[PDB]
Design an enzyme around this catalytic site. Structure first.
Site, PDB file in Angstrom:
ATOM      1  N   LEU A  14       0.837  -1.202   0.000  1.00  0.00           N
ATOM      2  CA  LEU A  14       0.000   0.000   0.000  1.00  0.00           C
ATOM      3  C   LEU A  14       0.873   1.253   0.000  1.00  0.00           C
ATOM      4  O   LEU A  14       0.805   2.065  -0.926  1.00  0.00           O
ATOM      5  CB  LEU A  14      -0.944  -0.003   1.214  1.00  0.00           C
ATOM      6  CG  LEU A  14      -1.872   1.200   1.429  1.00  0.00           C
ATOM      7  CD1 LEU A  14      -2.759   1.454   0.218  1.00  0.00           C
ATOM      8  CD2 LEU A  14      -2.717   0.987   2.678  1.00  0.00           C
ATOM      9  N   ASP A  15       1.695   1.388   1.039  1.00  0.00           N
ATOM     10  CA  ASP A  15       2.548   2.559   1.240  1.00  0.00           C
ATOM     11  C   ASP A  15       3.814   2.127   2.006  1.00  0.00           C
ATOM     12  O   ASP A  15       3.756   1.967   3.226  1.00  0.00           O
ATOM     13  CB  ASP A  15       1.773   3.642   2.010  1.00  0.00           C
ATOM     14  CG  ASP A  15       2.518   4.978   2.092  1.00  0.00           C
ATOM     15  OD1 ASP A  15       3.685   5.077   1.652  1.00  0.00           O
ATOM     16  OD2 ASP A  15       1.919   5.946   2.611  1.00  0.00           O
TER      17      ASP A  15
END
Lengths: 442, 442
Positions: free
Chosen positions: B123-124
């Site tokens: 995701l990040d």
């Protein structure tokens, strides 16, 4: 093993999907719309039939006699015609709508015929009856009585699709919801009967709803809550209130439409076809002129300098050169235009939220505060949350009649534990879950 | 047709599910946790192995040599050990975490070995890199340059589960998120570099986020945004900002914990075991006494009469007789207690929200304002939205290496169209959809 589904509309698809799972049942469909039943016949295996109800009552009598059960998904004014055919041929019926005063008169004839007719299924009416009577019967099991009942409910977009002036997207025709703003609201609160005035002053009754801190909601009361004392059998209660849920800003935008004179059933004004800019000039009073001219006139009419309401009309194109759709009134012309601008796309999710709240007095003396949350989201490659909550209760009740689980006879709602218990348990598997909480504080 | 998954944790389940669909691949799992790999082995067909990484480097060398690819789902400090074994045996690798300075030093050795090591997936980092470079490459296709880039992101409960003091539920250990409040934030805005002070004064940088009117959000900047000019190749940009999303009230509650002196790595105070009421007495200064006494002391310490912060501590049981969990510090003791009180139940949904915003200068002269929304909800009888967004990019990238789609060699992120294009298209089918909008206004 044979069923007739009168109606080929929004609710039909989840009803046809649920019934055609086992494979034993044979489904027939009757409708006015020739295009809908062809497209509906492609997805699900059905026997297509084309007929009008009030004109072709002869063939309806012969068609109903062939079936074991008849599901009516038509407008509620036409139920006495379908009910009359059912009592004659001795066939069961289920409905996804109100049991009207007209349908109530047949109760004597329906009992004598010896058949079952189950009305008031779906979301509202429907699930609201089932969730209410589940908790009320649980209270009476331990000798407790109901002092209060507050119920807010609401279908709306999923939060990610709420960025528009109304914070809303229409599933069906806006004519019903727009006209509710002009009507009154009545309910009971701490012994006293409260009346709320509709129309321009109805915005004063809107309140903030903060049971979910992450969700920015508003609420306001429904048409009538006082009739539910007799329905549920809770005349001892000092509070009876039913409301509707929306995102904040909805009712202020509809209040703007009331100020401009758009919420009425007067006819449209009569070489060149009529535009929205020209229509608002007629309503305000000025002649068809420039866009900046009518802008100054419109903001003057909308109370003081309410730029929010002005920009809402500008966004929808009410001060614009688009053509007005043909209709029998100004309200209908607005409704068609809102369906064009604020409808659900192919991949966009809808949402259902519901919040019950009971005040239960136990024979000990203490006060139980019970709350129920029901939340459901629409599927991307599937049915909407509104379609599921309206369709599945009627479909599940039909399967219970065919399999022979509901023993009771006559005209009735879903108030008995025989009906509501099995339905509430089965909707969990379909993705409609409801949680319960309870605390004590005398 | 052979893979090793080092790690049996939160992210492993969706990775094992995606890879074991076709049936051809043979999956092996290595982990410290003996209980996890047994429970994980029940659901999915795998070869279980038990080993420590830094102690048993001998058997790792022999085990890695048998495989075609090695997926590392371990803490990011241990990647150089796994990378060293991969370059020796000449085997490909994929990671679901940062490419650290330690891992960057091997780049010369990784190129000489002639293998692929793909880092910064999930995701990040991960999807944020892919969504950024999709739009940036589309701009450079038509000779346009990037003037601004603003990106807010955030995993949180679904709105219906947001009714608690923090409006939050923890997916993993709170130690990371709590310590971020004490750290600084740095970013670029209209040419000038902005520094934000962490700790007690960090609440001043929190702003309202109103892109979804129905959703009640707040936002604040991340650790560092200035490094992303070199990563994406947008040094011409005058604005570079990355932030985090939460429901309103979150940071004010964490600000309350900072005031009371709970966010630090000092040791716990030393017949009878320690309770939370006793711990807050020590922090405030008073002796272990009555509950109403420490209540007056706690509210005095929490600024003026901040009842909101007082009630938040009362709700969690910080002024209560529950035992403090054993830990090496006060922060760790709080973290364990928050996992106990604010974790996801079996049927409760989580949610991911992401909002990119580009300012693109075309060679004509006009300014394009592009925005991208990504939203995803957790499944009831399935994987969470956080598990899917972190797991699936790493899993999809692994399948592309085995099938032989990614031709490039060496150490790299997911910045090339060869990597991000196929992944962004395939995540739509898994229930991770993102919409795009664009307008012009010079």
């Amino acid at each position: 093993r044979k069923v007739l589904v009168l109606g080929s509309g929004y609710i039909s698809e989840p009803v046809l999907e649920y019934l055609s799972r086992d494979g034993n049942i044979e489904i027939t469909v009757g409708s006015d719309m020739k295009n809908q039943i062809e497209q509906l016949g492609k997805k699900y295996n059905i026997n297509p039939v084309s007929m009008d109800i009030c004109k072709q009552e002869e063939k309806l009598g012969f068609l109903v006699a062939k079936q074991d059960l008849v599901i009516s998904l038509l407008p509620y004014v036409l139920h006495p015609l379908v009910a009359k055919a059912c009592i004659t041929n001795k066939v069961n019926m289920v409905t996804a709508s109100y049991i009207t005063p007209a349908l109530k008169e047949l109760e004597k004839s329906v009992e004598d015929a010896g058949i079952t007719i189950i009305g008031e299924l779906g979301l509202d009416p429907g699930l609201d009856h089932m969730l209410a009577m589940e908790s009320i019967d649980k209270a009476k099991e331990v000798g407790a009585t109901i002092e209060s009942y507050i119920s807010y409910c609401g279908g709306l977009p999923a939060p990610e699709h709420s960025n528009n002036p109304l914070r809303y997207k229409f599933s069906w025709s806006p004519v019903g919801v727009l006209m509710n703003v002009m009507q009154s609201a009545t309910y009971l609160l701490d012994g006293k009967v409260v009346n709320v005035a509709g129309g321009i002053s109805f915005l004063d009754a809107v309140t903030s709803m903060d049971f979910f801190p992450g969700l920015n909601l508003e609420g306001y009361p429904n048409r009538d809550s006082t009739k539910y004392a007799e329905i549920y059998g809770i005349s001892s209660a000092h509070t009876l209130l039913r409301g509707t849920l929306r995102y904040k800003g909805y009712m202020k935008a509809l209040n703007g439409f009331v100020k401009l004179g758009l919420i009425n059933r007067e006819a449209l004004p009569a070489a060149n076809p009529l535009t929205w800019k020209q229509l608002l000039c007629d309503l305000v009073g000025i002649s068809p002129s420039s866009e900046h001219d009518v802008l100054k006139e419109a903001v003057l009419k909308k109370l003081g300098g309410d730029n929010t309401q002005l920009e809402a009309a500008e966004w929808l194109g009410l001060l614009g050169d688009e053509q007005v759709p043909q209709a029998e009134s100004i309200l209908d012309a607005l409704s068609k235009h809102l369906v064009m601008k604020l409808s659900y796309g192919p991949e966009e999710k809808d949402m259902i939220v519901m919040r019950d709240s009971f005040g239960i007095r136990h024979p000990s003396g203490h006060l139980e505060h019970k709350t129920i949350d029901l939340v459901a989201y629409g599927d991307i490659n599937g049915f909407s949350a509104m379609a599921k909550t309206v369709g599945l209760p009627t479909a599940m009740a039909a399967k219970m009649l065919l399999d022979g689980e509901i023993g009771a006879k006559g005209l009735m709602g879903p108030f008995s534990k025989e009906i509501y218990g099995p339905i509430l348990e089965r909707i969990k598997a379909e993705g409609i879950i409801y949680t319960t909480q309870s605390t004590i504080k005398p």
